[PDB]
Amino acid sequence: EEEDAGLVAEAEAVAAGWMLDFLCLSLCRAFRDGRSEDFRRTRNSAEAIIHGLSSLTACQLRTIYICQFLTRIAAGKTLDAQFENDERITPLESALMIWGSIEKEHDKLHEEIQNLIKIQAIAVCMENGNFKEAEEVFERIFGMPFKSKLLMIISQKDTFHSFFQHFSYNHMMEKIKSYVNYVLSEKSSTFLMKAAAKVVESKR
Amino acid sequence: EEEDAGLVAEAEAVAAGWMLDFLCLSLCRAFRDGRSEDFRRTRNSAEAIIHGLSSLTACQLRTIYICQFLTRIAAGKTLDAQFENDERITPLESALMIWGSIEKEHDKLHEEIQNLIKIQAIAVCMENGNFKEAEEVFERIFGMPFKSKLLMIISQKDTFHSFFQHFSYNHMMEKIKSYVNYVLSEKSSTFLMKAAAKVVESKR
């Protein structure tokens, strides 16, 4: 009986890992497509399956990080959203922390997304008239030329500036979508999605 | 592009159906074993996957009903839990409504579980000192000999009675667990669980 219970728990862990990969692929697709409601529902499903997983492989941690990163980016303009125990950390700052934690290549695209998130983390505060919060976000992020221009913009208390239109929220989203395309290609061959696709194709 | 999006949505529906069956099996096992925390976490996962399903087969509706029924039975003593739009309906009354809706055989076990839920729906109100609510539950349920004894017990305002010790909450749970064993046997051959079990066995 105890041996059977042990084998059953192991089988549940295997199935949960397959569900995590499928839900990550679905979340990536909803993010890339801009399907907001599908993204919300898939986020709910991914969070629940994650709470049922105990021990994680390095790949499973990476998959969870990718899900957490996309969730924070989708909430980047929601300054009332608290993703960290420290209530001062804004959603884009939380996304930056995960982006720097993922075991992935630090290629040119990685650094471009990183710098666009840093700029937008300040921009979103400015756009809401939260000037003191923009200065606090600036101090945490940098804790020279790029930094100096940002501080000057914050000091000018301009709710809008040409610099943010050049390094825009849309530009950040498009660069992140380029990265999401690579994750989609890499996880499209995962077990559950492959099996489901074969069934759908078999009925054509 | 639209054809690809259509095939992807169909594949997601196939995968969601497989996840629903696996989560139902896991919920049944947690209920049978009395693993309260695993039941809560699996309930959360099942609810999320269900919200991602649109069109349902008759079997998928039955599976959802089985999940909903077990959730109400697990919450049978939680009189603050509201499962229906009508806030007056108690959890055991909600379980009775689903039990009468499931497309299943009405064998002797079916009627025994039905009658034990009717008795306990009144008993749980009595045990909390909710005498007027017990009389209201009685009126909704019956809306002769068994009914007459129950009304007399409610009128005597006895928070405890030998009848409820004979037709007890534990007896209701044990009869329901006998039914859950049949559901477990029937759904153990579902795709995700079979594939996960084969992997675990392959590594032995």
Ligand SMILES: [Ca+2]
């Ligand atoms: Ca805030």
Ligand SMILES: [Ca+2]
């Ligand atoms: Ca109540």
